[PDB]
Structure formats: C-alpha cells, structure tokens
Write an enzyme that holds these catalytic residues in place. Structure first.
Site, PDB file in Angstrom:
ATOM      1  CG  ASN A 193      -1.968   1.582   1.092  1.00  0.00           C
ATOM      2  OD1 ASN A 193      -1.278   2.637   1.261  1.00  0.00           O
ATOM      3  ND2 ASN A 193      -2.783   1.089   1.997  1.00  0.00           N
ATOM      4  CG  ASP A 253      -4.968  -1.642   2.787  1.00  0.00           C
ATOM      5  OD1 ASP A 253      -5.233  -2.177   3.626  1.00  0.00           O
ATOM      6  OD2 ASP A 253      -4.828  -0.779   2.852  1.00  0.00           O
ATOM      7  CG  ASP A 271      -0.804  -4.309   3.606  1.00  0.00           C
ATOM      8  OD1 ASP A 271      -1.215  -3.635   3.464  1.00  0.00           O
ATOM      9  OD2 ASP A 271      -0.171  -3.379   5.002  1.00  0.00           O
ATOM     10  CG  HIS A 291       0.443   0.728   4.938  1.00  0.00           C
ATOM     11  ND1 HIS A 291      -0.725  -0.473   4.540  1.00  0.00           N
ATOM     12  CD2 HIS A 291      -0.806   1.297   4.610  1.00  0.00           C
ATOM     13  CE1 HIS A 291      -1.540   0.033   5.222  1.00  0.00           C
ATOM     14  NE2 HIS A 291      -1.936   1.306   5.132  1.00  0.00           N
TER      15      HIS A 291
HETATM   16 MG   LIG Z   1      -3.251   6.082   3.202  1.00  0.00          MG
END
Ligand SMILES: [Mg+2]
Length: 275
Positions: free
Chosen positions: A25, A167, A240, A266
């Site tokens: 992500n 995600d 994730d 992330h």
């Molecule tokens: Mg974001």
C-alpha cells in the site's frame, strides 16, 4: 519490539523458491516515488509487484513507472473520474494468461480495487478492500463488499489455486495490532470486519501465510499512522496479507514483512513460493 527473520527461500520439502511476490500500500504513487519507494522495489526485484492505494488513473501514471526495471507487463485500475483515491496496480515480469478487473458485481466495481491475473498453475488477486470509514459510516457497505468478495474468490478457487494479496483493511486478531483494546469500535478492528475475514479464510478456503508460519509472533505490523510518529514506537496494525489456497501450503517458503523499507505509511510484504 520486532525483527523480521531471515528470508527462507526453500520449501519444507527442500524445493528452491521460484516465485517472489511483493505487495505494498503506497499511500499515493507520487508521494511514494517522492519518498524513494521505487528505489526499494529495484532492490527487492520481485517477479510480481502489487500496489494498492495508487490514487492515480492509468492516463496519469508517472513516467518512472513505465521505466520500472523488470516489471514490463503492467495493469492498472482506478476510479475513473475521482482523483486522489483508491486505485490498484499489478506489475509482472511474465505476461499473464488473462487479466480481469473487479469481482463481477456492478456496485463493487466502480472504485478500482481489484485486479485478477491468471497464470499457468495459479491465479493472483490483488485487492484494496473498502475502509469502513471514520464513524463507521461505510461499515454496512463493507459487510456487503465482504460477502460479494468471498463468493467471487470461492468461485476462482474452484478452478485454480489462488493467491490473494493486498491491504485487506482489517487486523484479524488482537496480536495483529498494538492497541487492540482501544480499537474495537474503529475501522479495521470491528467484530463485523474481523468476522468477515475469519469466514473468508474458512469459506474459500485460504490460509494467512504469515500467521501460519509465525503463529505466536507479536508486534509484527505493516501499517503505522503518521499521527504521533507511530512508526518510531511500533504502534501499528497488520493490514496487509498473503492469503493462499491450502493446496499451495506445501509450496510456501516464507512470508515477509519488510519493516524498514520507507516510502509510505505501510511497509511492503513479500511472499516466496516454490511452484
Ligand atoms: Mg493511505
């Protein structure tokens, strides 16, 4: 609090890994590029790279993406008119047999959230699951999404072994975030979302690759809010995943969390399979 262990690149039956998939992500393609996210991709050199929250249509992709080393076969999906929102990408060294978009359901196919790539021995789905939103304003919609998505995956898994990554906007268990007790009424840790996820694993069926290999390992996260510099204190969430068909478990070498890789709020995750 957490140090991801060394990459295990051979299967339990001793077969070397032949496929490396990376999911990330990126929190906006242009922010990610600006933050040196591409530099890291070149170091990982995956066979397949899945990107979520690109916030970018294909018509406006940065040139740095056209020149991504190795990953020449690129497929992109986004909201068609709304900039700065959702969007997923799937980039592969090898050309897939077939690539499709969405889940076959008109209500859930407007926000550029799903790419399906079929290969010889398995099918790869990448997804950016709808957030339940502040105040849980999108929770009802999310439950409908979860049901349509589950049926769709069950359908794909009836034909070919499946890998789902992305995600998935849920921390499954209390071990999957730093503050479970403060978050039971928030997007990402409601019973409805955690239940949807559990039933997904059982209905398809799919195994959570990282938790299957590391069943008792705490403080392993993939997302930290920029708020209060959460990342520096490891106050995070595992949102994730690589989920795989049970038939692929003998082929599973490792499932990695690249905690130190910068570029987003992330971090990347990486799967090794011996197919
Ligand atoms: Mg974001």
């Amino acid at each position: 609090l957490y140090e991801d262990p060394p990459d295990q690149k051979t299967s339990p039956s001793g077969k070397p890994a032949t496929l490396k998939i990376c999911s990330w992500n990126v929190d906006g393609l242009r922010a990610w590029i600006k933050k040196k996210g591409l530099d890291w991709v070149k170091e990982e050199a995956p066979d397949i790279l899945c990107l979520q929250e690109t916030k970018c249509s294909e018509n406006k992709l940065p040139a740095e993406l056209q020149e991504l080393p190795g990953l020449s076969h690129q497929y992109w999906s986004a909201p068609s008119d709304k900039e700065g929102y959702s969007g997923v990408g799937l980039l592969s060294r090898q050309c897939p047999l077939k690539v499709s978009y969405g889940i076959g359901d008109e209500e859930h196919d407007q926000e550029g959230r799903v790419i399906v790539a079929e290969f010889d021995s398995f099918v790869l789905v990448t997804a950016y699951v709808p957030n339940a939103g502040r105040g849980l304003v999108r929770l009802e919609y999310r439950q409908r999404w979860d049901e349509a998505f589950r049926k769709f995956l069950k359908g794909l898994a009836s034909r070919k072994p499946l890998v789902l990554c992305g995600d998935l906007n849920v921390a499954h268990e209390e071990i999957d975030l730093r503050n479970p007790k403060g978050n039971k009424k928030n997007a990402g840790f409601t019973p409805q979302e955690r239940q949807g996820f559990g039933e997904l694993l059982q209905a398809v069926p799919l195994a959570d690759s990282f938790r299957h290999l590391y069943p008792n390992t705490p403080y392993a996260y993939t997302f930290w809010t920029y708020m209060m510099n959460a990342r520096s204190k490891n106050v995070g969430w595992r949102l994730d995943y690589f989920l795989l068909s049970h038939s692929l478990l003998p082929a599973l070498c490792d499932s990695k969390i690249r905690s130190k890789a910068l570029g987003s709020d992330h971090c990347p995750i990486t799967l090794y399979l011996a197919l």
